[PDB]
């Protein structure tokens, strides 16, 4: 029971740290530059993530 509690609390710490750090990268507007000009004709696109 002790070990389960420490494992759960350290995993909570890791989860909250990485989720709070990376939660701001979910954006509606994404600028992509993927170098597919040979197949499409344009290089940079402005995508919307619904």
């Amino acid at each position: 029971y002790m070990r389960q509690t420490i494992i759960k609390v350290i995993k909570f710490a890791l989860i909250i740290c990485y989720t709070v750090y990376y939660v701001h990268n979910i954006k509606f507007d994404v600028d992509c530059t993927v170098d597919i000009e040979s197949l499409t004709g344009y290089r940079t696109y402005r995508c919307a993530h619904p």
Binding site: V30, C32, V34, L39, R46, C47
Partner: protein, 88 residues
């Protein structure tokens, strides 16, 4: 990811420079789908793509940690003995 190309570019960036008329990109529907798939795979952040699966993995590990002592035989035998004789 609904992707629309930037008609005018300036140093790998969109330039953003009598009635109004729509911009003609001359792209097929399938070229649009190809662009959507490519930019979704490449330039969307990994967190946005794999947030629900990471959440599911974290919750499964949490449930396994909360129910490990119920399934581990060395502790489960003691627990069932305690519960049975205490209830009865």
């Amino acid at each position: 990811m609904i992707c629309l190309p930037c008609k005018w570019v300036t140093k790998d960036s969109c330039n953003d420079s009598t009635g109004p008329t729509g911009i003609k990109y001359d792209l097929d529907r399938h070229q649009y789908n190809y662009v959507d798939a490519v930019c979704y795979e490449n330039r969307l952040h990994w967190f946005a793509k794999y947030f629900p699966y990471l959440v599911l993995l974290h919750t499964l590990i949490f449930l396994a940690c909360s129910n490990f002592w119920f399934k581990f035989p060395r502790t489960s035998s003691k627990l069932e003995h305690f519960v049975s004789i205490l209830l009865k």
